[PDB]
């Protein structure tokens, strides 16, 4: 329904009390704001962006891309594989790059390491650096910060805790898959009913209801048909 | 349709021009009219009634049944086997016994043989005799006569004549049965078309497309079902 | 319509006055009637059945098939190739074999040649012979005869006669096929009109007005969609 | 209606009794039938086809087009201008070229002139010649003949005859055009009524009663609109 | 109905047997056909057109109007008063002027008098003259002739004949007007019934039963109305 939708493979019948304590989240960060973005040019250098283990192709910054829209274009094309996208948000501090990842789980935060040549433009390339270990939650101001931290969610099944790296999990209960969509209220768990029993093999009874009777009409009674003309 | 209704076992395709020249008929006769039937009682004796091959139980006429209605009741139960029934018809000549048979075909005429003791009542028992070899077609008057002659019918199939002993005939054309219901007009023959496979076998084949497809959901997709609360 | 249904490839515009004088027919014959078919068994020998060019497999008559129904079963499977089928018809003369062909045209008559060993049963095998060159049209009696003669049909197009070997003909008029279904009345010819472009090409052109216009919304107006909550 | 559909520019009122004695026709001819068209190839030469005034481009017959279908394709594109089309008709005499024109009127007959090199194939090119002055109406046989003669039609208006070169005529009655579609029965003339003003000008006048009245509300009553909240 | 539609002022009751033997007609003539009307220009002169009593303005033919269409335009505006209109009809003889009048009755024939200067163009002006006393009924050819003769119609009322100068007549029967629309069949007269009072005066009397009764509520019962809140 509104908290969890589930499905089954080949499992067993049963009932389960389930809580959702948190959802798995992905990473979304905001870099430092650039004053006067219409005339700002980044020094030449290299951008190394990673999300946990996974690394993006190193982005080389030159005069073909040392603008905000230039990095936006670069980042969006350097991250199509890993699911890292980018856009621009213009606030009272200036304009800034906003990067999002589609990867949920602990440790999948977006990191930006910067090699700055110290020359190439009017503003530093180093101010695009982002370290998930030190970065604060984003608040108003030109300073950088994360919007969401990548993290695991948590559910409980009949009292047993399960940290989840995605909101689509399988075999927490063997043969059962469900998509966790919202947190349950404190102490108010969902009852999950797995019925191995549908007496709807009476549907399969419709086979020999059809298979017999359908093959009594067009065969063995209407195989040869007559009428005047 | 209105002249002939047909049926099939398993035969072959083909077309046939059919004429119906006559129908098979059964026997129906009327015995002598009895003057003053309201006070008439028959002499003692025996009635032997037959229709062709078949003979009816010998009927003994005594003082428990020597009336017209008495003979009617006897014959009705002396003839349940062969399909001989009886009734009384009251005309300007009196009342008389009217006997019917359900056997169609040549020679299946109803015959009545009478041995009369010559005493037992006021009317002769002998005047209930009926010989189909001599009896005329019934006309007005006290005299006896047949109403219908038992006879074979006749059809032609593509020019070939078939005498039929019943209006329900089979295997005149191999594997085909039809009930002849009426005569065709002179020179206006019926076309009879025997069709084997149309939509064959694809009409009944649409079953096992479903019976198959139906065993995708309620089996192997609804074998185990989930629900939340 | 009811006399002729027509079709087109790609041809030219034009109008044609058409008469149908006759239809193409296939062969259908009836062999000699066999007296007392219920106890009749055929002498040993061979049946060679042909329809024009095409010859059927030589049929060997032995003690496994030397009955009428035995010949019926053989022919039905000895003739699946050429479209020769067989049945039995029971008339006042007895039972006889009735053979049909599906090949329309002149000379496609069914022929039966018989070599009779002169022994093997109670009836001659030779009386199943049929020579279309000598055989009369079937009439009542035990004698053999044809029911329909295989023959070409005839049509006229604007006065020009075309003999047709089938009632499904093509390219009598270039690019036009029609299935002739019935004869036209004497002096009442059908008008046949071949129309190339009406609403051309503007009927199907209304598609690419939409396919174009349809690719305004869901593409380039619904490429990116917004929503609030 | 079914005989004549009419139209008007701006004319005068009046009534007219109209007969249609004949329609304007176009030319349609059939050339000689070619025996064994499946292996027939034409001698070298030239085809000059004309319909009255109009002449078609001279057609050169060579080894790229010296077949019946080859001439069909040429004529179809050698005649797009004048409305001359062509097809092939296969009768008991063989296959032949059938040519049609769309120009109605007297003298607009299709003519075919042939210069034959006398060599190039197996059939003469000269037998495709057609002279409308000598050609008979087409009948069965290999010989050539016309199917329809190009001719003017004829109508009468209040007794006065008008020869028409097309079935779409104009200003026979000043300001009136009608498309003649069928012949009137002998002595059963059509009444044609030309009506100028009915509901005139008051049918369309009901507009400017509204267009006026409509400019009372949404203008000068809804020019400035008020609302509360 | 379909033959006669009638109306009343205030008359008396009665029944009448009515025949319609003929309708009143107006004049419609056709002048001489002009050969080569496309280059024809009329000599100088004057046209005086009259219909019975009424005379039209004298038409002066000059170099601004000495064509057929020029005369058409003049007459159309030289005749708006009397109901004389004109058009051109193009037949096998050429083009000609066709003039119509709307005045029904005996002697209201259209007459054309011509004074020809004998010079001014290529065709005589005198050939546009028309004398109803000598003119034949129009037939095919360049010659002039009338299309319809102006004439009175005729009806009979209970045997009494009335010549009518228009198909809209009044007070033939006092207080009764009817528009005669068609002829009655020979010996099949129409019955005409003039009914004074049916439901009289009680149909309209049902008004002042209400107008009275209606002035019970909204007046003298709803004069003063009460309500609570
Ligand atoms: Na900040
Ligand atoms: Na009788
Ligand atoms: Na009798
Ligand atoms: Na025969
Ligand atoms: Na026979
Ligand atoms: Na000819
Ligand atoms: Na010919
Ligand atoms: Na005349
Ligand atoms: Na004339």
Author numbering:
A (entry chain A), B (entry chain B), C (entry chain B), D (entry chain B), E (entry chain B): 80 to 308
Sentences from the paper on this structure:
We improved initially weakly diffracting crystals of FliD78–405 by random matrix microseed screening, yielding crystals that diffracted to 2.2 Å resolution. Our crystal structure of FliD78–405 reveals that it consists of two discreet regions with distinct conformational properties, corresponding to a stable head region and a flexible and/or disordered leg region. Residues 80–101 form two β strands that belong to the first domain (Head 1), the second domain (Head 2) is formed in its entirety by the contiguous residues 104–230, and residues 231–273 then complete the first domain. Despite this, we were able to model the initial α helical structural element, corresponding to residues 274–308, of this region. This helix extends from the axis of the head region at a nearly perpendicular angle, resulting in an L-shaped monomer subunit structure. In the crystal, FliD78–405 monomer subunits are arranged in hexamers, resulting in a shape akin to a six-pointed star when viewed from the top of the FliD oligomer, which corresponds to the distal end of the growing flagellum. When viewed from the side, the FliD hexamer appears as a six-legged stool, the legs of which extend 55 Å below the bottom of the head region. The leg-to-leg stacking forms dodecamers, resulting from the helix–helix interaction of the residues 274–302 of stacked molecules and the interaction of residues 303–308 of one FliD78–405 molecule with Head 1 domain of a stacked molecule, burying a surface area of 1362 Å2. Although the FliD78–405 crystal structure exhibits intermolecular contacts between the head regions of FliD78–405 subunits comprising the hexamer, each of these interfaces is small, with a buried surface area of only 665 Å2, and contains few intermolecular contacts relative to typical protein–protein interactions. Second, despite vanishingly low sequence similarity, each domain within the head region exhibits high structural similarity to the corresponding domains of other flagellar proteins, including the hook-filament junction protein/FlgK and flagellin/FliC.
